[PDB]
Nucleic acid binder design. Structure first.
Length: 82
DNA sequence: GCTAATATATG
DNA sequence: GCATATATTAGC
């Protein structure tokens, strides 16, 4: 898992114009508060619980998807929420 | 480790 | 005003 994962998520949130809640759900099937804590702590991927490392690689796996597919998934989750 | 709930912040 | 959003933490 890249040490850059944390800025790649923040850049992706800025770029997509998306909530922590929507990204957290589609990217790694977790809640808004967990992503908020994950982004604040920026814990060294090598120094991370397997639980947390699975989340980061779930996020990295999601972020390596085509921008077009990510943006479509974000829209489904919005209309599925709204 | 994480969730849902709650206290603040934004436009 | 307000909903929507995030930072925070009590509780499972």
């Amino acid at each position: 898992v890249s040490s850059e994962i944390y800025q790649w998520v923040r850049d992706e949130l800025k770029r997509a114009g998306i909530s922590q809640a929507v990204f957290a759900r589609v990217a790694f099937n977790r809640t808004q508060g967990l992503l908020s804590e994950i982004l604040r702590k920026e814990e060294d991927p090598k120094t991370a619980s397997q639980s947390l490392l699975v989340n980061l690689r779930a996020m990295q796996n999601f972020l390596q998807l085509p921008e077009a597919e990510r943006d479509r998934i974000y829209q489904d989750e919005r209309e599925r929420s709204l």
